[PDB]
Design a binder for this molecule. Sequence first.
Ligand SMILES: CN(Cc1cc(=O)[nH]c(=O)[nH]1)Cc1c(F)cccc1Cl
Length: 164
Amino acid sequence: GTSKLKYVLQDARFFLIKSNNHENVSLAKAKGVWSTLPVNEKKLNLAFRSARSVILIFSVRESGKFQGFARLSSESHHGGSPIHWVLPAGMSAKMLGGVFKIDWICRRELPFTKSAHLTNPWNEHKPVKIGRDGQEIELECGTQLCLLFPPDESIDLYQVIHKM
Ligand SMILES: CN(Cc1cc(=O)[nH]c(=O)[nH]1)Cc1c(F)cccc1Cl
């Protein structure tokens, strides 16, 4: 092992990222991209400039689990190849912010039952599973949460470390 993982997470910032469906997480896992509404786009762009690593921890709404976590490799940007996100009824591609590039650190899931001992100081010490989309997770809680996930032996953090 966990040493390279701990190195990537050192002095990182962490954000709880919701998805409306599994399809969008699948797209993010396949293409290494994420997009948010403008309010969270501004927060994440500020964080990306502020920290050695910004970690997105993903949870599909109503799933009772986290689906993995990834590190921002870029600020948001517009104009790339369009991503066929499954948007909710009534939401248009024009309402999205730019696209963030991300490097997956773990594509394995973690059930909320396994993180019941972790509370987030930045959300009133409620269990870390609880938060609005974009809720920041304090360093220690976020580090422990990431370390609970099953190791993803398919990923090599060597190239991630070189981007820091
Ligand atoms: C790429 N994106 C997935 C996504 C979901 C979510 O709940 N939060 C989030 O930051 N992104 C499109 C989108 C939706 F499909 C639904 C709400 C907001 C947005 Cl931006």
